[PDB]
């Protein structure tokens, strides 16, 4: 206790995160609303933001796969955590206008 | 430090308001994540080395 500050014991803790191909199991405290389909809505699936139209899908996800990508290399298929299904994300109607 | 422990935590909700009042002063340095938004994420596996 009479040592200098550059000698006193310091407790150190290191937290290492893992974002792997599996349902996260350390999700933070937040509520969960119901599920709505065939309507351009916002969403938050396991902390992943985005707006789109959740539609029923038919692609056969592998047993341990969690997310999915497209030929354009972006998120388009999501497996719902509470109820294990496969949902497709597609932007709602959109286009240019002319007068 | 020569035989540092490792603790694995899984299958639990993690509220981080606990670790805000643990000492009068401490260093909280995060690489890749900001502490304020850290509550609103979903890490898959988190390991603690003490």
């Amino acid at each position: 206790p009479t040592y200098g500050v550059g000698h006193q014991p310091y407790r150190v803790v290191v937290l290492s995160f893992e974002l792997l191909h599996a349902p996260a199991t350390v999700c933070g405290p937040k509520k969960s609303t119901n599920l709505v389909k065939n309507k351009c809505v916002n969403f938050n699936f396991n902390g992943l933001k985005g707006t789109g139209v959740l539609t029923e899908s038919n692609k056969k996800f592998l047993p341990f796969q969690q997310f999915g990508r497209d030929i354009a290399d972006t998120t388009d298929a999501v497996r719902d955590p509470q109820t294990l299904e496969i949902l497709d994300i597609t932007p709602c109607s959109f286009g240019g206008v002319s007068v | 430090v020569y035989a540092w422990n490792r603790k694995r935590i899984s299958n639990c909700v993690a509220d981080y308001s606990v670790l805000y009042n643990l000492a009068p002063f401490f260093t909280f340095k995060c690489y890749g994540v900001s502490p304020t938004k850290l509550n609103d994420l979903c890490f898959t596996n988190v390991y603690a080395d003490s």
Epitope: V5, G6 | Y20, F25, T27, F28, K29
Partner: nanobody, 124 residues
Amino acid sequence: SAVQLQASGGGFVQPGGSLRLSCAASGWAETFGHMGWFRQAPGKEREFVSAIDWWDTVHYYADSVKGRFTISRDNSKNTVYLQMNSLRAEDTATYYCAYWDMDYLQNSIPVDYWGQGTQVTVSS
């Protein structure tokens, strides 16, 4: 980061005397950085006086107060202390303890946080 600085000390003194100032820090910051004191004369600009690393290894002092002001650190209270003597009339000013949140100090221009002004007055 969220750091709160509590300052203590100050008052009215006689020229050439000694007085008492101390600053404590609380909260959480990015790293263990430097800590210093800043002087504001009435009607003048705010200038630094000194800067001490957290681990009390290297000290930096201004040319105008070298050999007359010193700063040290507690060993069981996490509160920085400073001592002075031979106070002159120009020392009547407002002092603020400031925390610099980087490991290695380069210059006093970028200041992170500021404390409540402690006014010290010296006269006959």
